[PDB]
Amino acid sequence: DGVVSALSLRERIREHLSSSVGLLFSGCTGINDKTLGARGGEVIMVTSGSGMGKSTFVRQQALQWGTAMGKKVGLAMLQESVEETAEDLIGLHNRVRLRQSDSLKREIIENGKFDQWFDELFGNDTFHLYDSETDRLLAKLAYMRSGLGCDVIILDHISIVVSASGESDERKMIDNLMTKLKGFAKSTGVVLVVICHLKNPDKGKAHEEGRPVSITDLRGSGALRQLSDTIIALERNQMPNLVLVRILKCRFTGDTGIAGYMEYNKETGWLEPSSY
Amino acid sequence: DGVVSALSLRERIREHLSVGLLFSGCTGINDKTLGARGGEVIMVTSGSGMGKSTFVRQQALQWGTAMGKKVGLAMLQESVEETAEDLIGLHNRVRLRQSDSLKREIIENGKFDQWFDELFGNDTFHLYDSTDRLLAKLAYMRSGLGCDVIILDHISIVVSRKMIDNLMTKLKGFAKSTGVVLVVICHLKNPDKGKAHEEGRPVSITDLRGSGALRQLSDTIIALERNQQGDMPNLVLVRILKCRFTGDTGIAGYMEYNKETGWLEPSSYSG
Amino acid sequence: VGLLFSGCTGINDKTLGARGGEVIMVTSGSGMGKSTFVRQQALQWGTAMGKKVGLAMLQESVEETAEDLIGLHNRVRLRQSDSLKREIIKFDQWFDELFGNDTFHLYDRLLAKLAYMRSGLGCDVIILDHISIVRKMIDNLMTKLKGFAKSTGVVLVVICHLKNPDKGKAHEEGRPVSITDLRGSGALRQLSDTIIALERNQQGDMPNLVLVRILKCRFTGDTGIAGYMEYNKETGWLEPS
Amino acid sequence: GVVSALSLRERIREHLSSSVGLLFSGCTGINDKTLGARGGEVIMVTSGSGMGKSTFVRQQALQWGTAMGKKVGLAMLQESVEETAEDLIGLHNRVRLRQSDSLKREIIENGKFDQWFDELFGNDTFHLYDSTDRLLAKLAYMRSGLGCDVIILDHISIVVSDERKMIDNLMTKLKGFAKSTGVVLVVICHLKNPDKGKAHEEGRPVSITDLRGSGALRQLSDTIIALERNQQGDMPNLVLVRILKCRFTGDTGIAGYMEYNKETGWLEPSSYSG
Amino acid sequence: GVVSALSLRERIREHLSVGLLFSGCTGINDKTLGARGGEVIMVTSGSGMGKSTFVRQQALQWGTAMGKKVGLAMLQESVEETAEDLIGLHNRVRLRQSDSLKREIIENGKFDQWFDELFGNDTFHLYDSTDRLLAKLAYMRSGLGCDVIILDHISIVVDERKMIDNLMTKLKGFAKSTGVVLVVICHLKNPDKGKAHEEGRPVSITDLRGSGALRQLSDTIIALERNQQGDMPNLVLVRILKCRFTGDTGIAGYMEYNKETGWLEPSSYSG
Amino acid sequence: GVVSALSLRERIREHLS
DNA sequence: TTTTTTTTTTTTTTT
Ligand SMILES: Cc1cn([C@H]2C[C@H](O)[C@@H](COP(=O)(O)OP(=O)(O)OP(=O)(O)O)O2)c(=O)[nH]c1=O
Ligand SMILES: Cc1cn([C@H]2C[C@H](O)[C@@H](COP(=O)(O)OP(=O)(O)OP(=O)(O)O)O2)c(=O)[nH]c1=O
Ligand SMILES: Cc1cn([C@H]2C[C@H](O)[C@@H](COP(=O)(O)OP(=O)(O)OP(=O)(O)O)O2)c(=O)[nH]c1=O
Ligand SMILES: Cc1cn([C@H]2C[C@H](O)[C@@H](COP(=O)(O)OP(=O)(O)OP(=O)(O)O)O2)c(=O)[nH]c1=O
Ligand SMILES: [Mg+2]
Ligand SMILES: [Mg+2]
Ligand SMILES: [Mg+2]
Ligand SMILES: [Mg+2]
What we know:
Six copies of one chain form a homohexamer. The first copy, chain A, is an alpha/beta fold. Chain A has helices at residues 10-16, 29-34, 56-67, 82-85, 88-93, 102-110, 113-121, 135-148, 159-162, 170-188, 223-226, and strands spanning 43-47, 73-77, 127-130, 152-156, 191-195, 230-235, 242-250, 257-264, 271-273. One magnesium ion binds next to α3 of chain D. Chain A: Residues 19-276 form the SF4 helicase domain.
């Protein structure tokens, strides 16, 4: 059976409300003030327009979670290969932009600074990446959780697993993927960040031109906002660097709305907090 | 044969007619739909994060304590420990899960076991720890527990149009046969023009996902609307969309939320 | 002419009432008052007419559909007034006045029961409220019901639902019903003889004023808006206005 | 297959010493905020109907073929093979070949046609295509067996002729073909009709959500370049380059101005100041 | 069909060793250079502004005066009426406006004097009234050996966007790599505000109704404009809207319409 | 489906009759 | 080895 009575459940509740909770974000204060960080067993969705910074933010959140907090991070980065996304974290830690400079790459090859920068970051087994059917992908994510023991797992660009699969109705495939991913995150008890896109508006401005994004702008289905626990949206106007955060849904607490403001650093690559 | 003449039916009508379970908050509901009744299916509709589960958890708490009836929760969306902590926090007027300074306070003060048997001391609240399996488990509740109210949290994840028609016919047959008060939460569809349901747009009876049997096989539909990114996200509007057993529908009342306590309590608002 | 309709007297002025061998469709949205209309039609064709009427309410039980008839004849809303359900228990005086004959024959495979209601019970009107649990499996059912009504020659009323509209308002907010708006298949309008629709703004300014629409009529031909009925929430009788 | 990022120490090194962008031609404001064209890079090019997509991309192909030594593979689907080959021969020699019968009759008699053919096609850097699943196979054979460094597609709307899932799957397959191969992939697309106001051919500025067919054209593209000129205005030969999206650097906006030469067919870097 | 650049040593040589000239207005040929092998020309105007009269004049001047095989596919009228239109236009009269002029040509035997001068050299071919038409145009081009194929009134032929897009794609793919001048007559959408198309509104390139793929696959676009309610109802204007070969768009010239012979003549109107 | 110009020698007179 | 109904989501146009 599975009909658990609420009287014979005292020890489970006692060991549940004693243990987890925490794991704050980075770059803005209002996100941690509203959502109270990221918890095990949740789903955090992060959205933006096209080229608006929905991956720089997430890698900047993964660097601090894998370095300043010691959590094992598993990055299923499907946009770029593992030769670029593991090298973009080197300069992000060392406060430069290594891929966007042919001079600095030759400099760190010559003098031997590349070994120091590789050992200062990857001195511990904390980053376990992935390079590239939705059946083997969840198998590799379950191997990252069970075998490798990753505490935070990031699924970037979910649009190329619902469009790279041969399915007649795309909506039901997105629905099945979302409920199976939520079941994985709830069963294994892992923080799971999901990155997706937005749809075209019918009339008016575009999301890359300062349009405030609503909750119904999520592209593909309606299970994206109905089976997620926290929805975070990033909106700027290409002041093309002032980006604002908008908590569209918080399930744990109730407070939603504009969290704050962040400013991008073109020289180092960090998302600093703003004042406005 | 299964035909019954209307003359030879005096005894069965005599023993049949020889209000029901009231609602908590927005007292224009039980003035309008006359409360829940045995052998009915109730639908709770809103957008994402608008407070459907919170609108039904108060109902389970007030029907398991002040009424004494056996209540069976089926949270398919979450775990049993989270909804149990939610119930213990909601009865004790202190928001439990969303405060970490008190989750460790009551475990060392010793009053956690005081709060436990004060509301879970009887055999009232029965939980479900996660198609035919769910129906068999609810029938096992009804049979071996005598549950008066059965609450179901998510109808959409049962689906892995006809599979929802068959499911709703089977749940309506279960509720009509066993006479249990069945409450089902469902979601809304994506509107194609105008505002969204999360920004204060009123809910129609068409705007329901899955199929059209959600509105054709249930006895009442209650919608809750609130403007999430608005001037205040606390004032909710409660709308009766259908009622077989009375007939009158429309806007019933208004409630606030009271973020410190978490009780949907009715407030005065003319318009 | 045939049997006359009670309420919205522009029906039998337009389609001249019901006739033998027909299949009458009563189609509306949820809560528009389909069962409330056909219950009045069943009451007025077994008391003032005297013909045997066979009810088949697969949607509810055999006790509530008789309590509503006893309350409807006695001008008192019985199932909603909790005090008068125990005040009258003169229950037998209300019971034997309207069920004293052998008129009505309720119902707790289906076509054999309808044939037993026609032959073995002598029913002149046969009412079916729920067909959705009863394309090709709907086409075969509708051909079998049309052959039953053709061979036996009985007045037949069948109730089904409407389709979910993809653009615009809902039928519950007063959207007029077209003949295409029918679930299941297309045989609901090809093998019947008349279709009656009720349209009322349920979440509106007044929800007690229905609009009656004729959608098909092989004999008289005239379709369109028939009339308006008020509901009279005190009594529950659909009366024209 | 999962990897641990400490085993990558020998491959992160190798990719550190490999990657170099290919410089554009005709405008120097494009190369300042794109830094070229790298391996595994889908570059979308768009404008209005008749504003200069094919001329720009053909000039880019010519300058990447005859000036930088890179082997180039074309897949022009609007015109045949001989039309675009004559376009390349007439454009390299700074004349207008097909739009003049007198020059075509002149160069076939005095024997200078072979002098114009050899100086282009001696080193065999150009490879052409003769006209959705066999197209990717032919492009894979063009990349692997032949060895071209840049692959150009043209007029993607023939390939998709529900179109939305078709163009999404096509864009997904082209982005997956560009990645993990090391090829620059130029893709040319069109624009939808505007709702109200004026037309794209009348000088209206193009937004990023005007790419017709889906929204997946801008969600899988690294760099998106748009061209805009007014054919009915005072100067109908001054095109404006607008970088709509750049994933590598992130600098978008007006790149620069180019002036079209009606006599030599060269869109050249202009000096117009708005 | 992966072809290297060394394989085109002799194909380019053969391809190097001609624009078919538009009659009635010399302003078109100065900014278009005629029409080549694989040339899609689109002709449009308002409702009743004279598309088919101009295209009929073009077909008559290319058929019997320049020696090119012209294949008509007029879908407005049948074969008999468009043959009557060609014979009446070639013999400088107005045929179908008077019964006496139609009757007089047979009472003296000069009706056989008009068929032999037109349809004796077999330069014309007709069609009698979507994927079945292209297989007929392929036999008209490859089998009969024609050069200019004309199609009329696309509105009966063609969600009316995917069908017209696939039709335009198939016609462009048929025109490519075959060597035929394909002329297509289309219409314009209804104007929203301002003056109508029957009063002389300047047409834009995005007025081609049905889709936006009618200007993305055409090689040349020609529009006609006439103010039949103004002071001069017998004066038309020709506007090049798109030219892929040269790139010169705008007003080509002016032509005077006549109500006596049916011809429309080159004029010298000034603005 | 395609009618040549030789087939209308007397059909045009048939249409004018 | 094939024709009809139901329903949620992304685009391009129409009086
Ligand atoms: C966050 C941010 C990034 N940038 C720059 C830095 C990045 O290299 C570039 C965007 O890189 P990405 O953040 O990777 O772009 P994206 O993930 O939002 O879009 P998509 O995956 O759909 O292609 O823009 C800004 O200019 N301003 C900003 O605020
Ligand atoms: C009703 C209501 C809820 N809330 C907050 C408090 C709850 O902790 C939080 C959770 O809302 P839920 O009750 O969980 O909302 P939902 O079940 O309808 O949405 P879904 O299941 O699809 O995610 O909502 C308010 O802040 N104000 C309100 O008026
Ligand atoms: C006709 C009508 C009904 N009603 C109310 C009173 C009745 O108690 C209530 C029940 O109507 P029903 O007859 O039960 O409606 P229905 O059978 O068409 O819907 P479904 O079978 O899908 O559930 O309708 C009005 O309020 N005003 C009216 O005009
Ligand atoms: C760039 C440019 C070209 N032209 C001329 C030269 C070209 O041969 C002609 C257009 O030819 P293309 O450049 O090939 O036209 P297109 O690709 O933009 O449009 P489409 O393929 O959809 O038809 O216009 C100008 O007049 N002004 C200009 O600025
Ligand atoms: Mg990204
Ligand atoms: Mg919920
Ligand atoms: Mg009913
Ligand atoms: Mg082109």
